Structures are given as C-alpha cells and as structure tokens.
Design a protein around this nucleic acid. Structure first.
Ligand SMILES: [K+]
Ligand SMILES: [K+]
Length: 327
DNA sequence: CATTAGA
DNA sequence: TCTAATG
C-alpha cells in the first residue's frame, strides 16, 4: 500500500504504456500481474533479486526494480514520458470515443492535438464529434448540488410518462459523494422482466420525454436497453449556462433491479466484501441475482428479490444505507 | 463483460 | 461479421 509503492507505480506506468502506445497486450499483461504481486508482498523489496523470487517477476522486470531502487528514476520511463508520440496518444484518448486504436491511427495521420481534430472533424464519427464538442464539459466534475437538480428532473418526466416506472440514480451519488463524474440512471418496469419479451419502447418513451423538454441534448448511442447520452440543466435566468453532462439510462427486467441497483451502487469494495460473505452465508451474488449455493460445488436457482433488503436478509447481514456502503 | 456503432 | 469503445 506504500511500502511497495514506487515499484507498483513505475510498473503500472510501464504497463499502461505497452498497452496504449504499443500493442503489447502481453508485456502489458505482464507488468500487471507483477505490479499486482509485488503489491501484496509484505516486505520492502530491497532488490530485483528479492523481487524476482516472486511469481510473474522475471528478469525483465527485476532489472527494472534494481534501476529504480538504485536511482530514483528509470530511463525507459524517462524516455516514454518525453516521447511526443506516446504523449500524443495519451491525450487523444481523453476524447470520448477515442480508444487507443483510434489514437494511434490519428497520430499516424498526424492529428496530434485538439486543434487537429477540429480541422479534421470529418475523420471523426458522431460519438467522437460529440466528445470533441464537449471536451471541456466532459472532463469537469458534477457537483452533487447539480446531481440533485438532475435527479429531480429525471424522476419527474419518468413519472409523467408512466407512473409504473421505477428509476434510481446509482453510483457514488447514491453513496453520498460530494460530486460525481456522470449520471447513471437504472431503469425498470413491472411489465419487463427476464422472460417478458422486451418492450424496446420502455426505454424509448423515456428518452423521448427527456429530449422533449430539453434535458437530453445528444445521443452517443441508443439501443433497446441501454441509452448513452449528454444532458444539460436549464440555463437559468442567464449569466450562467450549465456544462454539458454525460448521462446513461439502462432498462432492466424488474425481476433483477435491486441486485443491479445493489451492485452499481458500489462501492467496488463494499461489493466484493458483501459478495465474499454471501459465499460463506451459502450464496452467490452478481449484477443480476442471488442464488443459493449447493454442496456439489456450485448450484443455481435465483432467489426472489423485491428490495435491497431481501438480498441483505438472505445473507443475514446488517442493512447498510448506501451512505455507508463505502466498504 | 455485455451492449452499441460502424464498416 | 468483427472489432472498437463504454461502463
Ligand atoms: K519468479
Ligand atoms: K476516450
């Protein structure tokens, strides 16, 4: 957590690089298990050699550990950090809709900057255009105070359209968080669950609503179960318009809401942890259900859930307000 | 780890 | 169809 710190950081620096700038999925995957394993290790690595005894720790990496231990740096890292191409790649990547694969390509064509991409809007797809369009706004955090204004609007139309809907804004928003990165609305309806052959409209009606009143302003991608957009709070009585915000709405079979909600509410740890416990408690939990364990090794058979409680009850735990689902 | 775009 | 990009 801090004793193996630099080593793990150096290493991830390294991994991240192969994966992006290079297409070394392997080396990339290499640096990762290593950083992983050096990370668990309970002692101060004092040398490659010592490290080296670890699993995943080969000669390539150990060598790296010595240099880093030896001097407070590493050339390779110094070199990559300098590297205009790689730099270029790292940056393009901040554009929404630009993964590495596109970053490389663009670079190749020589589009290394924001300005570049503008001049070349034509080489970009809708998602990418939008992302470009909102590069600043997308990068900016969402203050809760705003999160409260968006949530408010959202539940309102949802309800106007059909009173049968159930919506929930998940994420750190749900867990307290002073600000968030984007809004995640989990949607469902009684008339749609596991079997009941869809109702693509169910997603549609809603988006259409939000659009109709100018809450939604663009669509990144819209499918029958997952819509991915951009929204904006009504710019007041002037002098202050709101930043463009990413939103995602997703339909869910009512018979799997709460686990979904559960899950998506996080946190990553509270989850893993509550999850590990259902194992003892004789269960299995995942983004959609909760099944009882069967001695033979594994088992099936989804228990029925009507609320975040049911899941709790089942693993015979203390109901945890989202607020403190921190871990 | 599953859903969407796009070519 | 595959492959990229999100989350
Ligand atoms: K080893
Ligand atoms: K990106």
């Amino acid at each position: 957590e801090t004793l193996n710190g630099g080593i793990t950081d150096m290493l991830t620096e390294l991994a991240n690089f192969e994966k992006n700038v290079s297409q070394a999925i392997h080396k990339y995957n290499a640096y990762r298990k290593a950083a992983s394993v050096i990370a668990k290790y309970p002692h101060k690595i004092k040398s490659g050699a010592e490290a080296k005894k670890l699993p995943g720790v080969g000669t390539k990496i150990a060598e790296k550990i010595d240099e880093f231990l030896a001097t407070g740096k590493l050339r390779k890292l110094e070199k990559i950090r300098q590297d205009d191409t790689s730099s270029s790649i790292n940056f393009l990547t901040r554009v929404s809709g630009i993964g590495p694969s596109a970053a490389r390509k663009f670079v190749d064509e020589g589009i290394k900057t924001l300005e570049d991409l503008r001049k070349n809007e034509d080489k970009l797809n809708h998602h990418q255009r939008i992302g470009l369009k909102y590069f600043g706004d997308f990068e900016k955090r969402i203050p809760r105070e705003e999160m409260l204004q968006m949530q408010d609007i959202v539940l309102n139309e949802v309800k106007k359209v059909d009173s049968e809907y159930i919506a929930t804004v998940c994420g750190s928003f749900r867990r307290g968080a002073e600000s968030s990165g984007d809004m995640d609305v989990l949607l469902t309806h009684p008339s749609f669950t596991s079997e009941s052959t869809k109702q693509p409209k169910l997603l549609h009606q809603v988006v259409e609503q939000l659009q109709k009143v100018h809450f939604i302003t663009d669509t990144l991608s819209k499918g029958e179960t997952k819509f991915m957009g951009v929204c904006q709070l009504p710019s007041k009585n002037d002098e202050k318009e709101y930043p463009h915000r990413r939103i995602d709405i997703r339909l869910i079979p009512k018979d799997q809401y709460y686990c979904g909600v559960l899950y998506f509410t996080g946190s990553d740890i509270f989850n893993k942890n509550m999850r590990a416990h259902a194992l003892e408690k004789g269960f299995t939990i995942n983004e959609y259900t909760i099944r009882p364990l069967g001695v033979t090794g594994v088992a099936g058979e989804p228990l029925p859930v009507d609320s975040e409680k049911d899941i709790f009850d089942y693993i015979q735990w203390k109901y945890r307000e989202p607020k403190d689902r921190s871990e």
